[PDB]
């Protein structure tokens, strides 16, 4: 179990760690988060009390280095940094652990939620979408735009999600216009899965990564990407049986985890009604359709 120590907490902030969150008061003696499960990516995220504008945070994998958080009073945010001196860090973590100034990652033993939300999300693969190669962790916030959003402005601060566009020459084979538009299987299976991603594991991870940024940061372009990747599968008549079954599981845990009160903004009525009730795969998402109908029957 790994540890993200905090040098201090000088400003009142709500701190998230994966799907958990806690309030830290201004200058409270908070020195970080311990007992973080090894084997998964994680996200540590922030919303300042004095300005809920900009949720921001850091995707990281404790296997890739020793990361700590320290507030920067010039740039006005909690920054993640990598400690290279393993003995300073191990000593720092031990002293703070002895004074019990850390919160414990509060995972219920029965609970597989985080695993189920991040099964295909890797840090190196996450680094393709968020480019900042001098760091092993990745910053994301509410306002960052996606490459596709910029096409329709600062490229260094963009989310480089895979551009999906149903009315594009990439999506539509000359001479198969109606076929390819009404049944997107060639775009899904040949263009995206065999040509851009290499495998469905990679496709699901970006879909999961797009959902988590939408949910944790209210990142609108991430939400667009999540729905586009769902719609591309559901609008394909020919999808491998194992992808459909895994998709149903992925979406089930995403819908299960979504805050009830954010459904109005994080869920696109057209996509979901189309996917569950009109598309080729309208009968292939049993678990997802059941949780959607019992939890968000209004949207439908």
């Amino acid at each position: 179990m790994n540890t993200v120590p905090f040098t201090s907490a000088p400003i009142e902030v709500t701190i998230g760690i994966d799907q958990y969150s806690f309030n830290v008061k201004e200058n409270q003696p908070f020195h970080g988060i311990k007992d973080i499960p090894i084997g998964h990516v994680h996200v540590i995220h922030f919303q300042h009390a004095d300005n809920s504008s900009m949720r921001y945070g850091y995707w990281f994998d404790c296997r890739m280095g020793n990361f700590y958080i320290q507030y920067d009073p010039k740039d006005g945010l909690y920054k993640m940094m990598e400690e290279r001196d393993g003995a300073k860090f191990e000593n720092i973590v031990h002293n703070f652990k002895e004074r019990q100034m850390m919160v414990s990652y509060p995972k219920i033993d029965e609970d597989d939620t985080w695993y189920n939300l991040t099964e295909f999300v890797q840090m190196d693969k996450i680094r393709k979408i968020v480019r900042k190669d001098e760091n092993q962790f990745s910053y994301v916030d509410s306002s960052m735009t996606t490459v596709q959003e910029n096409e329709l402005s600062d490229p260094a601060h963009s989310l480089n999600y895979t551009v999906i566009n149903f009315k594009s020459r990439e999506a539509i084979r000359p001479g198969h216009e109606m076929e390819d538009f009404l049944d997107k299987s060639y775009y899904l299976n040949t263009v995206m899965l065999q040509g851009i991603f290499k495998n469905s594991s990679n496709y699901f991870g970006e879909l999961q990564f797009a959902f988590l940024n939408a949910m944790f940061f209210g990142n609108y372009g991430s939400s667009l990407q999540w729905h586009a990747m769902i719609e591309l599968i559901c609008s394909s008549a020919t999808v491998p049986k194992h992808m459909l079954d895994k998709l149903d599981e992925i979406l089930y845990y995403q819908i299960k985890t979504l805050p009830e009160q954010y459904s109005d903004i994080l869920l696109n009525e057209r996509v979901w009604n189309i996917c569950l009730y009109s598309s080729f795969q309208k009968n292939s998402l049993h678990n997802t359709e059941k949780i959607m109908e019992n939890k968000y029957p209004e949207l439908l």
């Binding site: 594009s168 539509i172 216009e177 538009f181």
Partner: protein, 237 residues
């Protein structure tokens, strides 16, 4: 965006544009089968592609053979329309290609947009106007060439005859839409009006009779009466 009353004069500016109407592409008669079920029999149709500034009509005849063995024909008809319009654009020299294509029915937008991806600079637009182009098959010479076709065929017409020698394209389009609105509301009466006078003939190379300017004002007046007349018979006003 969408073409409507507010931006109506844009039709007659010098930016090449075409209206595409797909109403008459997929045409059927519905009938009883020997077993007492219902079946459709397709008949020949046509795409109505019109330059409103010049009157040039590209009438692509859709022969019933294009439907053979196909499913979901009403959906296919939109995509076939879009395929044929795209093929027409590609056949034209660059300086004759349209800068905009206005579709009379919004269901044509995605089919045409997808077929025209190779032309990102051609705007595909809907319209809020309710244009009477469905009545094109009430023009005898157009109906004749469509029903006589034995294979796919494109026939070129000027739907304004020689009117543009004497009137502007705004006035010509207004006359055309009045005539077509009349034929659509009461075809028999409209054609009676157009042909009641044996001395006024249709030239072999024309679609409409050779009316003088003064006879056109009379004709136009009679068509507006008919459209109001039918509007009363329909609503009991």
């Amino acid at each position: 965006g969408a073409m409507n009353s507010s931006n109506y004069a844009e039709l007659f500016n010098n930016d090449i544009k075409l209206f595409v109407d797909d109403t008459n592409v997929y045409r059927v008669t519905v009938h009883k089968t020997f077993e007492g079920n219902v079946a459709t029999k397709a008949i020949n149709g046509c795409i109505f592609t019109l330059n409103p500034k010049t009157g040039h009509l590209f009438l692509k005849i859709i022969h019933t053979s294009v439907w053979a063995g196909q499913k979901r024909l009403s959906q296919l008809a939109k995509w076939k329309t879009a395929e044929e319009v795209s093929a027409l654009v590609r056949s034209l020299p660059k300086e004759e290609q349209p800068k905009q294509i206005i579709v009379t029915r919004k269901a044509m937008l995605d089919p045409l947009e997808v077929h025209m991806l190779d032309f990102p600079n051609i705007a595909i637009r809907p319209t809020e106007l309710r244009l009477p182009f469905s009545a094109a098959m009430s023009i005898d010479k157009l109906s004749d060439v469509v029903m006589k076709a034995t294979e796919p065929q494109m026939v070129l017409f000027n739907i304004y005859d020689d009117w543009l020698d004497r009137i502007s394209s705004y006035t010509a389009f207004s006359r055309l839409t009045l005539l077509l609105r009349a034929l659509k509301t009461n075809e028999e009466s409209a054609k009676m009006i157009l042909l009641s006078d044996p001395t006024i003939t249709i030239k072999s190379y024309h679609l409409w009779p050779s009316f003088t300017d003064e006879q056109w004002i009379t004709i136009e007046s009679q068509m507006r009466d008919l459209i109001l007349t039918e509007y009363g018979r329909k609503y009991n006003v």
